[PDB]
Design a protein around this nucleic acid. Structure first.
Ligand SMILES: Cc1cn([C@H]2C[C@H](O)[C@@H](COP(=O)(O)O)O2)c(=O)[nH]c1=O
Ligand SMILES: Cc1cn([C@H]2C[C@H](O)[C@@H](COP(=O)(O)O)O2)c(=O)[nH]c1=O
Lengths: 211, 211
DNA sequence: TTTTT
DNA sequence: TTTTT
């Protein structure tokens, strides 16, 4: 049974948009971007579509946030599967925000090539717990680094419905090596950072749980 | 309006206990202990009373965890105020667990003086958001370090009731200095570690929010 | 963030 | 962890 948290502090890369589904459900959408100072010292940039659903979507749009505003987001990873109009299954993990608040300081905006900004000195953290969906296999990158792709299923329950989010994690170097023995079905906890390249969790820590 | 998260990976310092209130409410209690490798490289030990309330208390006791088992806890900081039997107001912040799971590996248990164990290579993280309760003032420690005590109120809503948790944070050195300007009422977010000495949040990061 | 001892 | 596009 699942756990699923993402915390992000970042800037709106540009203006958010409010839209409505067929059902009339309100969706608020923003691209939150920043750059983390990853202490060995890397600058890891990231850009995440964040969405707020329902009545909070309309509460959020009332706040009138603009490109460049810095915000903190508390949210979860949302897995979605759909059929493309061109035919064929598609799937993606994005960020659903349970909350978004504005920072009270002007952050430093790093300008990018394609017209957007990202926050300097940002924050990005994920904690998720679910079950490994299949036996992983150790690979090597062109530079020789051990890498392990881990697929897990995070069970969500919310008239009581069940959802599964299929979340992918990358474990590097010694982490990759310590976790080689993981099997289909094994429950696991992973913290890390949420990265673009598709949305993946880059693991900084993984723990195998009992059962 | 509040946010309140604590994540701990640690060992049961000794055997947990199941007890019952006057009302009959089940309380499960454990002392979770470990040691964090704080990357400048300190070993910061900590011992926290963790409690689970209600029917999950009895689910937890069914699991029959013993001194030395390693667990992950997801929880919140719970502020409690009471009158001592000897007369006079008392108050304390402890950890209420929403969840506790057992690790699937044997961790390394560091033995302590008074008969307990603590987990080597543990994890301790807190994120809280609330409003500053009073103007803070910069102090210095005997060694000359800037230190700032920050008091905040985390509003919780749950027939709809309001609770306030009064949580204290310590900000050191440059953090202490960057946050000198905070005023009574200012909303603030703080991540850090949960430390003994009374339970305090040692801030690694603080952000002032708008309003 | 359901709740106390 | 309420929910989709
Ligand atoms: C504005 C924006 C840019 N980008 C990418 C496209 C550009 O190739 C890149 C900008 O280059 P940079 O990362 O070297 O500053 O950022 C996004 O992925 N999402 C966005 O919303
Ligand atoms: C077993 C246990 C010990 N302790 C403290 C009391 C001892 O003075 C100390 C042990 O010394 P140490 O920290 O140098 O190993 O740990 C707790 O605070 N809570 C506990 O549950």
């Amino acid at each position: 049974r699942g756990m699923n948290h993402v915390y992000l502090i970042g800037a709106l890369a540009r203006d958010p948009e409010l839209r409505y589904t067929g059902n009339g459900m309100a969706v608020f959408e923003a691209t939150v971007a920043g750059e983390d100072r990853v202490i060995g010292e890397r600058n890891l940039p990231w850009y995440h579509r964040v969405s707020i659903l329902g009545k909070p979507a309309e509460w959020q749009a009332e706040r009138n946030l603009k490109g460049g505003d810095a915000v903190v987001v508390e949210g979860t990873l949302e897995y979605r599967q759909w059929e493309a109009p061109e035919g064929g299954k598609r799937s993606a993990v994005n960020v659903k925000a349970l909350r978004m608040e504005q920072l009270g300081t002007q952050p430093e905006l790093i300008q990018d090539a394609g017209g957007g900004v990202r926050m300097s000195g940002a924050m990005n953290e994920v904690l998720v717990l679910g079950n490994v969906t299949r036996d992983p296999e150790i690979r090597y990158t062109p530079a020789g680094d051990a890498v392990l792709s881990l697929s897990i299923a995070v069970n969500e329950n919310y008239q009581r419905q069940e959802k599964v989010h299929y979340i992918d994690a990358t474990l590097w170097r010694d982490l990759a090596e310590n976790m080689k023995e993981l099997r289909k079905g094994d429950p696991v906890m992973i913290m890390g950072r949420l990265v673009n390249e598709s949305t993946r969790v880059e693991a900084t820590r993984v723990e195998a749980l009992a059962r």
